[PDB]
Design a protein around this ligand. Structure first.
Ligand SMILES: CCCCCCCCCCCCCCCCCC(=O)OC[C@H](COP(=O)([O-])OCC(O)COP(=O)([O-])OC[C@@H](COC(=O)CCCCCCCCCCCCCCCCC)OC(=O)CCCCCCCCCCCCCCCCC)OC(=O)CCCCCCCCCCCCCCCCC
Ligand SMILES: CCCCCCCCCCCCCCCCCC(=O)OC[C@H](COP(=O)([O-])OCC[N+](C)(C)C)OC(=O)CCCCCCCCCCCCCCCCC
Ligand SMILES: CCCCCCCCCCCCCCCCCC(=O)OC[C@H](COP(=O)(O)OCCN)OC(=O)CCCCCCCCCCCCCCCCC
Ligand SMILES: CCCCCCCCCCCCCCCCCC(=O)OC[C@H](COP(=O)(O)OCCN)OC(=O)CCCCCCCCCCCCCCCCC
Ligand code: HEC
Ligand code: HEM
Ligand code: HEM
Ligand code: HEM
Lengths: 76, 101, 49, 68, 60, 240, 380, 51, 54
């Protein structure tokens, strides 16, 4: 839309918030930050990682093929 | 068949909009036909849809998902927007055919 | 009914000195505001440097 | 002539290692194959390069503690 | 006895002009203290290598 | 041959992230450059006043400038003349033009060593491996006159004779002048000549690291403090 | 009455663009990146202005002026290396901004996308001529190579290249006009960024779910104000550690030698942000075909909104096209690696397969995957 | 693009062919005049006197 | 000056500033047009010309 006067039509929705001075800025940061991060990692790792694994394999293979191509052949 | 139905449930779980509580028709991109079909909805389904969208945006904002008992299960995903979308699409094809001839 | 609504529990997010509902505020609000504004002031000092 | 460069000592000590003498004997085989022949166009730059690669890796591990 | 941020809020952090004055005074003292600390850390890491550590042998 | 050789990694005293140069080594390397390297190579972007506060004092660098004779002019009748050097004078060129350098150095042009650490792969490791890596050529390699085998040079045929040996000069501080020590000193001096801001760069990096180690958690705490209204907000849907 | 922030005609523009702008609550850190780009642009301009205070665009003194900046000007080395590493940081932020737009379906904002494509072309041209400006070996030889590929155009190409050169090759006139154009183009980039923001604020911004975020929107101030300041501070951490600790890990050593038309380098490359386009051009064994391959690679990036055949906008709920997207990003990484390698075995066939897979993934595989997803989700 | 495949759109295209061709003639003549193209201006009789 | 007198640094920084200021002048002219367009133009009679505008 354009401005906060009219963006959408919402009926029967209640929301609750507290002051920033009455809540902790890091509420149980590690104890619930670790499992959420591993949950997101388990959701995305099978889509993200194997292309970059293929890139690493292709990079290593092409490099070692280049140094084997630079060497000489014993036939002469 | 049954194998295709099981694979389609597996793909429904892999899509991941059920973890935010969304239905199938909530995730449609708002084109002209989709906005017209949304405008043709009854107010109860309209309010349910926009509360589900607001809750999904809030969950994405805090990078979390719903509890697994609150996920949208596969056999209760009712296609509410689909007949309105078919009506809008068919009348737009009729207008397109009339303008074409 | 509008009296049927209730604010849910925020005690997982609240500070330790506002966790008890049977004790008053205003003898700990200055400490919380001083902590947050000390964080802001130290950030401002570093940015100014 | 009585003042000793530490680089020579570190270099010969690194020539007393394991893969360095395998590169040494490979370069010896290259030298005997090339020098004891006529009408060839083959050099021993590769085996010499492997020998200096191993030897100078060993030297660069342990040279600068002997320099003031 | 009140907590130290409570005293800081009651004296300095309440008014915005006093907040800015506290920020400026802390900027001077923080600049001086951090310059001393960082110079000491860098010189302790690089003892005997800088010019200021060896210039006494050539000042004659 | 087109096949080449990587120089190894040497443990320099300035190799660390916050570790400075050793200025005594730079002073010795400047002595090595003056007594050996300056006959063929140039330092067109380095002057004597750059040595003040790094390797030499004001009077030491002024004596170093005054011990060489530089070009000045024109006078009142438009004639060039020689004068004693000054602190603002740059390091003197060995040749007036590169064609004279090519004629004097058997066709080859000795490059200007002001960025020779930054213009070569490996940096001062390459210079240390080149200066200490002169060896006899292997069998099957025929080498012309005026060319010398150096495996670290690309093509393995350099036009530079081996310029340093043991007692190639006498140090002022009594350090024994072995080939490796002289090569390390001149490599440290060339690294300083390529990057004269190196110590100040690392000191500024240390100060930046300490300020960002202070400022990342504080700005993160400010962001989380302002976003805690949204991140703890509860929602409820109550249709009638 | 006294609500000056919404009544003053100057102040209401800043208000409407940065304070009371309704933004989606759920946008991730990726949405920071474009703001970083603007800040990085400002940084470039500022550093460039101070670099313009001591640089001379003369072929006998350009390298000398660069060395005088790095040695004699107080903190001139800092300004120069902040300028170079800020160009690298600008291209990093451009790549991540474009990748966000590709992933989250933001190309359906078509005018914003097209103004972005024009901005990307302008920034690439500006960075190319700016890299020509220090007049090292690699600057001169890269300018010569790129202008020869421009001369590959039939029947008008040679006259156009001698018109751009101002003569027979890269010379004094080329360097001086490149300094003039490198000065003037970032201000046009800033004006095009104003047009970019105008079109986006006309249409609103997207969220990672791809849904209508009108139900949950927040003011830009102070949420995204403090979030983009945190992003700017992280970007300045990475930029300043790149300047003060590893100043030469992205640059090339042969640019520290003066330009010699007699001596050619054994291997000529552009900088790292042009290497994927260099590998795309170099893979086809033709000149005009390679130039058209580079131009049409950036042009199919522009053509991307016409290939969207899915009823969902973002890729958050589209795993097959997610896999294809990450294969495409992986292929771009491979092309960037190949562009820095010389033409021997097997780099030619690897670059050829990489470019073929790049065009096949963008043009063919993604709409087919979207159609398969629409079948699998029982849409039609 | 099957939206514009009909008799009305074919009639509209047929009606707008001569205007588009005349505009293409305008563009070609302007391009030849502005670039001073020798492949065409060497054939026009009065223009030959300036070469 | 960047020195004791008017020298090379003065000329180079004057080239940079003379290059960069007309674009700031163009931006200030855009602000000038906006601040005029909030209220329209004046007429030589100095009266309210709202009844006769073209
Ligand atoms: C095991 C792995 C670590 C797990 C862990 O610490 O989890 C805690 C926690 C878990 O997060 P969560 O509670 O599940 O949800 C995130 C919060 O809601 C909200 O947190 P957030 O991460 O969304 O915060 C906003 C975001 C904003 O991000 C930005 O501003 C960055 C924008 C991009 C900058 C790019 C610069 C150029 C890059 C070139 C390449 O900040 C970050 O992403 C990192 C901020 C780091 C601040 C300094 C910390 C010291 O981890 C984080 O918040 C991630 C950052 C940790 C540091
Ligand atoms: C400055 C003087 C001209 C100002 C514009 C003008 O009056 O244009 C005339 C008119 C508009 O003014 P007009 O309002 O008098 O238009 C009358 C149009 N007719 C006669 C058809 C009813 O512009 C044009 O007709 C197009 C001009 C450009 C023609 C194409 C380019 C020619 C050169 C190619 C190289
Ligand atoms: C980058 C490294 C991997 C980052 C990562 O973890 O990405 C996963 C993330 C998942 O995001 P999403 O699918 O929305 O799920 C949210 C639900 N928790 O997915 C994302 O963050 C997707 C967006 C990534 C955008 C940047 C990656 C591509 C960068 C290069 C693009 C090049 C484009 C073409 C340029 C030349 C033309
Ligand atoms: C089948 C399941 C996965 C395998 C078995 C493991 C099961 C583990 C079960 C435990 C739960 C794990 C967490 C689950 C999270 C969500 C689901 C998920 O991640 O699914 C797997 C994922 C996507 O699967 P999906 O996209 O649904 O499959 C489409 C097929 N119809 O990803 C995949 O399916 C794998 C995708 C692999 C892609 C490989 C690409 C190789 C080629 C890359 C080339 C790159 C370079 C190209 C260069 C060209 C030029 C040289
Ligand atoms: C005259 C005999 C010289 C002396 C004394 C020094 N150098 Fe030199 N150098 C000389 C020539 C003719 C050349 C070019 C030869 C060629 O084959 O190209 C060089 C070259 C170098 C280089 C560049 C190596 C490269 O890969 O380009 C370096 C780094 C170098 N020389 C170092 C160096 C040092 C440190 C010296 C003082 C001990 C020194 N050289 C003296 C000629 C002469
Ligand atoms: C209008 C603002 C700008 C001015 C006045 C400017 C000016 C200059 C000058 C004088 C140089 C030469 C000094 C040097 O070599 O470091 C230079 C180099 C360079 N500029 Fe800019 N520049 C500007 C903006 C940009 C932008 C927006 C970019 C792209 C991100 C850019 C990219 C570069 C690059 C890549 C170099 C080469 C750096 C090097 O190799 O040393 N410049 N610029
Ligand atoms: C010159 C560099 C650029 C600058 C300064 C710039 C600036 C911005 C800014 C400030 C935003 C709004 C904040 C945000 O969402 O990140 C934005 C968004 C956007 N930009 Fe750019 N941009 C640049 C390059 C590009 C390019 C090259 C493209 C095209 C590929 C592009 C397309 C977009 C799109 C589509 C959005 C909308 C994001 C969304 O709502 O999802 N931008 N840009
Ligand atoms: C940089 C040079 C300047 C440019 C490009 C510029 C541009 C313009 C333009 C386009 C207009 C509207 C057309 C008009 O009424 O003439 C205008 C009007 C005006 N300008 Fe400027 N201006 C400039 C300098 C100034 C200066 C120096 C002043 C202050 C003395 C000024 C004060 C005004 C005023 C008061 C008007 C309103 C005219 C009226 O309604 O009577 N301008 N200017």
């Amino acid at each position: 839309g354009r401005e906060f006067g009219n963006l959408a039509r919402i009926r029967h929705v209640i929301s609750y918030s507290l002051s920033p001075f009455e809540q902790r800025a890091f509420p149980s940061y590690f104890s619930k930050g670790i499992p959420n991060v591993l949950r997101r990692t388990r959701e995305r790792i099978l889509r993200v990682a194997p292309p970059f694994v293929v890139v690493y394999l292709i990079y290593t293979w092409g490099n070692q093929e280049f140094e084997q191509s630079k060497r000489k052949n014993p036939a002469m | 068949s049954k194998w295709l139905d099981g694979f389609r449930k597996w793909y429904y779980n892999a899509a991941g909009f059920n973890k935010l509580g969304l239905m199938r028709d909530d995730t449609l991109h708002e084109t002209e036909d989709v906005k017209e079909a949304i405008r043709r909805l009854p107010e109860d389904l309209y309010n349910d849809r926009m509360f589900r969208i607001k809750r999904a945006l809030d969950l994405t904002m805090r990078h979390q998902i719903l509890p697994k008992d609150q996920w949208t299960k596969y056999e209760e995903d009712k296609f509410y927007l689909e007949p309105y979308l078919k009506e809008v699409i068919r009348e737009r094809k009729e207008r397109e055919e009339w303008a074409k001839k | 009914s509008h009296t049927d609504v209730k604010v849910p529990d925020f005690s997982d997010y609240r500070r330790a000195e506002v966790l008890d509902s049977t004790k008053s505020s205003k003898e700990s609000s200055e400490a919380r505001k001083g902590f947050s504004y000390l964080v802001t002031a130290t950030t401002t000092v570093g940015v100014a440097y | 002539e009585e003042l000793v460069d530490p680089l020579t000592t570190v270099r010969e000590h690194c020539e007393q290692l394991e893969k360095c003498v395998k590169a040494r004997e490979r370069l010896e085989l290259c030298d005997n194959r090339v020098s004891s022949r006529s009408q060839t166009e083959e050099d021993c730059t590769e085996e010499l390069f492997d020998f200096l690669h191993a030897r100078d890796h060993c030297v660069a591990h342990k040279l600068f503690k002997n320099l003031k | 006895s009140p907590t130290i941020p409570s005293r800081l809020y009651s004296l300095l952090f309440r008014r915005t002009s006093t907040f800015a004055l506290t920020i400026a005074v802390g900027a001077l003292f923080f600049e001086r203290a951090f310059d001393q600390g960082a110079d000491a850390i860098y010189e302790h890491i690089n003892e005997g290598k800088l010019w200021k550590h060896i210039k006494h042998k050539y000042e004659n | 041959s087109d096949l080449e050789l990587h120089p190894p990694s040497y443990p320099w005293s300035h190799r660390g992230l916050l570790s400075s140069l050793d200025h005594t080594s730079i002073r010795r390397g400047f002595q090595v450059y003056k007594q050996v390297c300056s006959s063929c190579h140039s330092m067109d972007y380095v002057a004597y006043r750059h040595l003040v506060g790094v390797c030499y004092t004001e009077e030491e660098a002024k004596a170093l400038a005054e011990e060489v004779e530089v070009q000045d002019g024109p006078n009142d009748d438009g004639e060039m003349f020689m004068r004693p050097g000054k602190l603002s004078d740059y390091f003197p060129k060995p040749y007036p033009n590169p064609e004279a350098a090519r004629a004097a150095n058997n066709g080859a042009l000795p490059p200007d060593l002001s960025y020779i650490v930054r213009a070569r792969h490996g940096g001062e490791d390459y210079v240390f491996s080149l200066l200490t890596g002169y060896c006899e050529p292997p069998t099957g390699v025929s080498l012309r006159e005026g060319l010398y085998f150096n495996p670290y040079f690309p093509g393995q045929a350099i036009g530079m004779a081996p310029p340093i040996y043991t007692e190639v000069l006498e140090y002022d501080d009594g350090t024994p002048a072995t080939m490796s020590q002289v090569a390390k000193d001149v490599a440290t001096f060339l690294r300083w000549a390529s990057e004269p801001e190196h110590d100040h760069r690392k000191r500024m990096g240390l100060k930046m690291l300490l300020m960002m180690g202070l400022l990342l958690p504080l700005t993160y705490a400010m962001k989380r403090h302002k976003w805690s209204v949204l991140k703890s907000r509860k929602l409820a849907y109550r249709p009638p | 009455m006294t609500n000056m922030r919404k009544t003053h005609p100057l102040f209401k523009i800043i208000n409407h663009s940065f304070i009371d702008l309704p933004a989606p609550s759920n946008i991730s850190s990726w949405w920071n990146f474009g703001s970083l780009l603007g800040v990085c642009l400002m940084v470039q301009i500022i550093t460039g202005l101070f670099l313009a205070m001591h640089y001379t665009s003369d072929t006998m003194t350009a390298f000398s002026s660069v060395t005088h900046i790095c040695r004699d000007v107080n903190y001139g080395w800092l300004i120069r290396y902040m300028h170079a590493n800020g160009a690298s940081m600008f291209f990093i932020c451009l790549f991540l901004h474009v990748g966000r737009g590709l992933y989250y379906g933001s190309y359906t904002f078509m005018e914003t996308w097209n103004i972005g494509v024009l901005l990307l072309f302008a920034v690439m041209a500006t960075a190319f001529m700016g890299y020509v400006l220090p007049w090292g070996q690699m600057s001169f030889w890269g300018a010569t190579v790129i202008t020869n590929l421009l001369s590959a155009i039939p029947y008008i190409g040679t006259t156009l290249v001698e018109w751009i050169w101002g003569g027979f090759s890269v010379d004094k006139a080329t360097l001086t006009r490149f300094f003039a154009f490198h000065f003037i183009l970032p201000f046009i980039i800033a004006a095009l960024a104003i047009v970019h923001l105008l079109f986006l604020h006309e249409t609103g911004s997207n969220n990672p779910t791809g849904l209508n975020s009108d139900a949950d929107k927040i003011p830009f101030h102070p949420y995204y104000t403090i979030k983009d300041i945190l992003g700017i501070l992280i970007m300045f951490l990475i930029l300043m550690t790149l300047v003060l600790f590893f100043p030469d890990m992205l640059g090339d050593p042969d640019n520290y030698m003066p330009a010699n038309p007699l001596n050619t380098p054994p291997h000529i490359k552009p900088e790292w942000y042009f290497l994927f386009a260099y590998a795309i051009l170099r893979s086809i064994p033709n000149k005009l075909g390679g130039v058209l391959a580079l131009i049409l690679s950036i042009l199919i990036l522009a053509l991307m909104p016409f290939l969207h055949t899915s009823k969902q906008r973002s890729l958050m709920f589209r795993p097959i096209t997610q896999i294809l997207y990450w294969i495409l990003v992986a292929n771009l990484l491979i092309l960037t690696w190949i562009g820095g390698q010389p033409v021997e075995h097997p780099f030619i066939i690897i670059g050829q397969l990489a470019s073929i897979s790049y065009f096949s993934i963008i043009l063919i595989l993604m709409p087919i995957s979207g159609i398969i997803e629409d079948k699998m989700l029982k849409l039609y | 693009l099957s939206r514009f495949l009909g008799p009305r759109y074919r009639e509209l295209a047929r009606n707008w062919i001569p205007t588009a061709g005349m505009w293409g003639t305008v563009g070609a003549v302007g391009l030849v005049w502005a670039t001073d193209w020798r492949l065409i201006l060497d054939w026009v009789p009065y223009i030959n006197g300036k070469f």
